[PDB]
Amino acid sequence: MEMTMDWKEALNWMKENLEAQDYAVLSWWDYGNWILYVAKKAVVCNNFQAGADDAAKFFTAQSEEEAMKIVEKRKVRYVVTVEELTVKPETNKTKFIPIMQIAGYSPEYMKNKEIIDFFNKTMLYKLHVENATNLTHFRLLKNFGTVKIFEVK
Q1: Which stretches of this protein does UniProt put in the Extracellular compartment?
Q2: What is the Cα–Cα distance from 53 to 68, expressed in whole angstroms?
Q3: Which of 151, 43, 54, 130 is nearest to 86 (CA)?
Q4: Residue 136, Cα to own-chain centre: how many angstroms?
């Protein structure tokens, strides 16, 4: 996985803008090392074994209430979403599949539209796609194109 322009700008921005290091940044485990070592901020997960399941439960949650349980449990202050995690209308490819699998779902038994309909009710959708406009405890902080960072409130 290569470092994109958007990621470079996002990581540099959080390095000098987020409170210096108490709290953690929640994102998919694939980006953990970047946030931890490049942005110098604690993460919910940076590998598959630990924290990845918490992140998956958060992203696949259908209510802010259920999502806030993970936020409180992990001391989450910021959330980072990425376009490659979302479901796109033009393809079946998306990291939402492994996210679902780790969350305990078996997408291979679901119809394509059932997967899309499910995605449209999740936190990942309400955050990245709707820009948290319909969320009470989350607010879009900075939009780096494919990478977005949200603040917990």
Answers
A1: 2-153
A2: 15
A3: 130
A4: 17
Burial 25-41 (b: 16+ CB within 10 A, else e): bbbbbbbbebbbebbeb
Q: 147-152 and 76-82: which strand pairing?
A: antiparallel
**Half-sphere exposure of residue 141, counting CA atoms within 13 Å on the CB side?**
18
Distance separating alpha carbons of residues 144 and 104, to the nearest angstrom: 30
Task: Answer yes or no: are the C-beta atoms of 137 and 152 closer than 8 Å.
Answer: yes
Pair 94, 45: CB distance under 8 Å: no
Coil vs helix vs strand at 96: helix
SS3 content of the chain, % helix, strand, coil (to 5): 45, 15, 40
Tally the residues of the chain: 153
Residue 74 DSSP symbol: H
**Residue 151 and residue 103: Cα distance in Å, rounded?**
23
Token pair listed for 121: 């009710």
The angstrom resolution of this structure is 1.9
